[PDB]
Every structure is written in structure tokens, then in C-alpha cells.
Design a protein around this ligand. Sequence first.
Ligand SMILES: CC[C@@H]([C@H](C)O)n1ncn(-c2ccc(N3CCN(c4ccc(OC[C@@H]5CO[C@@](Cn6cncn6)(c6ccc(F)cc6F)C5)cc4)CC3)cc2)c1=O
Ligand code: HEM
Ligand SMILES: CCCCCCCCCCCCO[C@@H]1O[C@H](CO)[C@@H](O[C@H]2O[C@H](CO)[C@@H](O)[C@H](O)[C@H]2O)[C@H](O)[C@H]1O
Length: 527
Amino acid sequence: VGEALEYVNIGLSHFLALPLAQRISLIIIIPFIYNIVWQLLYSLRKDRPPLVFYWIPWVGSAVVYGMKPYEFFEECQKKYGDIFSFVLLGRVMTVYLGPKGHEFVFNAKLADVSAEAAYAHLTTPVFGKGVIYDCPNSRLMEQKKFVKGALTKEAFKSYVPLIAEEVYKYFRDSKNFRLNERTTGTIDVMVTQPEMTIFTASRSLLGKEMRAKLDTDFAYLYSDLDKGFTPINFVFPNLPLEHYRKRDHAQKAISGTYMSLIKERRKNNDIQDRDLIDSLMKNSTYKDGVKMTDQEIANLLIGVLMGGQHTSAATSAWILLHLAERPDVQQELYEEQMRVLDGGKKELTYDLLQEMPLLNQTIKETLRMHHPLHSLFRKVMKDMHVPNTSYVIPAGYHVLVSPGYTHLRDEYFPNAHQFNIHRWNNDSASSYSVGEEVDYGFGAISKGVSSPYLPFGGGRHRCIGEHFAYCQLGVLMSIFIRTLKWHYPEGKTVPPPDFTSMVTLPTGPAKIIWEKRNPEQKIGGRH
Ligand SMILES: CC[C@@H]([C@H](C)O)n1ncn(-c2ccc(N3CCN(c4ccc(OC[C@@H]5CO[C@@](Cn6cncn6)(c6ccc(F)cc6F)C5)cc4)CC3)cc2)c1=O
Ligand code: HEM
Ligand SMILES: CCCCCCCCCCCCO[C@@H]1O[C@H](CO)[C@@H](O[C@H]2O[C@H](CO)[C@@H](O)[C@H](O)[C@H]2O)[C@H](O)[C@H]1O
């Protein structure tokens, strides 16, 4: 026995004396073996969801999850049911699929899970300090209340002619169109739609000055910041490379530009109700009396604009891509436009937009088939018991909810991979609570989150951009439809999504051919 412990020490001594070829080998062999041995032992636990088996330690199932997460989820669901875990670049992700998973994650108690712990490294290096996920949840709650204050029906009534003007200016001036000189052409929708999205969102949310900045070489800083918004930040939020230096420079340069305008407005008492900058200047005091700083206001503007940027641009790209092979839908949308707008002799308004159910259904169905965020995360902060099961999700795990997966299940949407706006006949609203409501600090929202359709999430982290997105996408598509027909180049079809980008944007290049419905039509104004 004691003789055995001497040979332990002797063996530790011969271990250290191995050739570095074998020391390195054992430094790879041993973690690999322990990994398999640990999973086998882990698979015995009754109080843990099944864990997806994986060969490479730390890396885990990262590759297949990034490649095709919904296909990854469907196979895991067939072997294990609706709750299962997998490891992901160092973390254990516990997936809860379906409406009860929406309920488990979106309505989790604030003490149990943390969104800022999952997201802060993704967003803080892009947006700046102090806001969104670089702050306590109750600060986020009031930030959402401040922003929502500029997102009112009356705000939407004035945004509509502004967004319309921007769309027409883009048809007139952009290289991709020039409708006054060309009656047909080919565009890449991942080129045109990010540009149309930033032009229209700038003009309406940021205001006339910040929109004017985009006609200068200042627009290059927006490109730099936009490039810093990448899921690489989940792993490498700060690397001493040039990518990160352009991003950081841009955040300072852009937030400096907003602080410049904010300070000029306050210095001149020029604070109105024009844009979200005005609104946050008048309404950014937290409930404990602390005011947001001009730096925090500008970082919140960056965040709101940048999140809205990627979700909205991806969605209008998909709308265009689904309609390019559906000339029947384009025709039906065109007729609705002629009826609602008296043949075009009525100007588009926010209220008339609400009388365009097929247009809004087309947005709604695109968001069904293309949730821009396939996976939403929380870090588990206290152990969580999974109701009706033996499972306990321990602190340090992550929970993963995926309403976009349920969007594509035939159980809840018959023929789920068919694009059919008519599945929403009589139900064209962007969403609506099926019953009771609750207020986390930014307005009463649906208490239950068991709806199989959840493009905007639910609970305390629920989107507040839904009506701005519909207003923006609504004006934009109304004008596209009334102005152009479009179709695919020959043999091309809807592309598959890129599930490794920030949003589930289409795999490019994704080109459509447009044509003027009225070749002789000319867009006025000066260029
Ligand atoms: C390593 C080998 C490699 C090979 C090649 O496979 N590989 N292997 C694996 N993968 C891989 C695997 C998975 C992924 N990602 C999964 C995670 N996704 C993701 C994206 C965004 C997320 O957003 C978090 C918040 C929520 O709200 C937002 C956004 N927002 C809401 N409304 C408007 N904006 C928000 C809110 C408020 C604001 F004010 C602002 C905001 F922005 C931000 C959360 C999750 C990205 C894709 C990527 C790659 C690989 O590439
Ligand atoms: C197609 C358009 C959009 C979709 C599908 C969408 C989706 C979502 C989802 C699913 C969440 C919840 C994330 C989570 O629970 O982890 C969210 C949150 C949020 N979104 Fe959007 N969004 C869209 C557009 C916008 C726009 C246009 C804005 C701003 C103008 C915006 C601002 C926000 C904010 C401020 C939050 C709250 C983040 C939090 O509380 O953690 N979104 N959105
Ligand atoms: C006897 C018949 C007489 C008929 C009288 C008719 C009165 C009509 C009154 C219209 C009310 C709209 O008036 C005003 O609209 C603006 C929108 O630009 C709103 O402004 C709102 O959106 C803007 C733009 O994001 C934000 O900067 C602002 O913080 C927000 O509150 C005002 O909060 C609202 O007060």
C-alpha cells in the first residue's frame, strides 16, 4: 500500500521525463479521453437533460450548430425530445424547443437568468459603455421605455413621408437604380437593402442632420462600425488587430457626432419632437433620479440603430427574394395598393398602411420563414428546475430559446416551408397578446409567451422595434410594389440562409432583376 504510493511518485517522476513528442501527445490524448469518459458518466445523471455527444473538447457541436442550427435542432429533438444540451466553444447550451421553451426562457425569473451576461461581449464593444447590456437589467428596462417614447403612432405618422422620400431618393440617385435613366437593371439585395435601411432609419430616427452625414465620407465610419457587429465578438471581442481599431475608432467618431448634435441642441434650446435624439434629450432620467450622460444617449442611439439595421435589412432582402419568384403575390399586392391608395392618387400615410393587410401579411410571413435571430441566449444564474421533469439546469449553463425553429414546424404552421401570406388572412397584425398582460418597465406586453409565432420574443427582453420595423418595411415595400416588378435571373431561386452571420441573412450574392412598371415615370427633386 505504502509501496504503491512510492510508485505513484516514481511514475509522476517518469511522466515529467517523457520526450516532448510524447508530453505534447499526452497533452492532447489525455483531455480527449477524459472528455469521452466524462460524457459517458454525465449521461448517467437523471437530473440533467441529454447532452449531445461531441469529439473535440471545448469546441463541441459549434460547427454543425453554426452551419444549420434548425437541422441540428431537429435531429436532437428526434433523439432526445424538446430539452437537451450541447457544448459550444466552451459553454454548455441547454436548448428548450417549442412553446414550452419560449415559456421557460422568455418568462424565466430575473433572478434565474441573465441576458446581459450572455450578450454584453457581443454588443458593448460596438455600441459603447453604459447602455443595453453594459448595465443592470432595470437600466435596460428604462432605456427601452425612453426609446419607446419616440415610437408612438404620432411619431409613425410623421416618419412615413420621411421614409417614403428616402426610398424615392434612393430609386432616383443610387447606382443600383437610377429610375430616371434606366427602366430595368440587376441588383444585389444585400447591397441595396442595407443602404435603404440605413438611409430611412437615419432620416426618421436620428434626424435630418445625421442623415445628411451619410452623404459624406463620414459614411465610411458607419461601415467600419457595422463590420464590428459580428458573432466573432462572442469569442474575440478585443484583438490587437486593425478590424478592432477601425470599429473602436468608428464608435468614438460616431458617438462623438451624436454628442456634438445633442450639445448643440441643448446650447440653443433647440429641443423639439423631431426624432429619437430630441426624445432622449427630453426623457432620459431613470427612476432613481440619475440622468443618462450624453455619451450613454449616443451609445443607446448606436445600439438601437444597429440592431434595427441588421434585423430590418435582412427582412426586406428576404421579402424581395420571396416575391421575385412569386409574380402572383406581387400582382395581389399591387391591386391592394391601387384600391387602398385610390389608384395612386392618395399619398401613403401611417393610417393607410394599416389598411393594407396583404402587405403586412407578407412581412409577417417573411418573418415567420426568416426569423433574423435563430437563437436567443441567457446565462443561468441560479439552478433551475425544468417543470414536469427530473432536470435541473445549473448555474453557469446557458439556456437557448429558438422561436424561429417553431416557425418552421408543420405542427404549428401547416406546410411550413411554403411561403404563403394567406395563412395570415384576418390575422395581419405584427403580433398581439392572446390575453393577459404585464409591464416590466417599458409598457404592458403579453404575459404568456407560449405563442408558436414569436418574431419579437417576449417577456422582459421583448423587442420594442416591432412597429417601427413594420412602418419602415411597410413604406418601403409599398413603394417597391407600386414602382417596380422584379424576378430572378434565369435558373436562380431563393437562397438558403447564412446562419453564421449576425442575422440569418441570405447567402449571397442574391440578385434580382427589376423593371419599371411605368418606364416613363420620373422622380422629381434635384440630383
Ligand atoms: C468556429 C467554426 C465556424 C464554422 C464556420 O462553422 N462556426 N461555428 C459556429 N459558428 C457560429 C455559430 C453560431 C452563430 N451565431 C449564433 C448567435 N447569433 C446571435 C446573433 C445576435 C444576437 O443578438 C443578441 C441581442 C438580442 O437583441 C439584439 C439584436 N436585436 C434585436 N432586435 C434588433 N436587434 C439587440 C437588442 C437591442 C439593441 F439595442 C441592439 C441589439 F443588437 C442583440 C444573439 C445571437 C449569431 C449567429 C455564429 C457562428 C461559426 O461561425
Ligand atoms: C424585423 C425586425 C425585428 C425583429 C424580428 C426583432 C426581434 C427581436 C427579438 C427576438 C428580441 C429579443 C431578444 C432576446 O430576448 O434575447 C428583440 C429585442 C430588442 N429589439 Fe428587436 N427586432 C426587430 C427590429 C428592431 C428594431 C427596428 C429596433 C429599434 C428601432 C429593435 C430594438 C430592440 C430592442 C431595444 C430590444 C430589447 C433588448 C432586450 O431587452 O434585451 N428591434 N428584438
Ligand atoms: C375641434 C377639432 C380640433 C382638432 C384638433 C386636432 C389636434 C391634433 C393634435 C396632434 C397631436 C400630435 O402631436 C405630437 O406629435 C409628435 C410626433 O412628431 C409627438 O412626438 C413623439 O414622437 C417624436 C418623434 O420621434 C418624439 O421626438 C417625441 O418625444 C414623441 O413624444 C408628440 O408627442 C405629439 O404631441
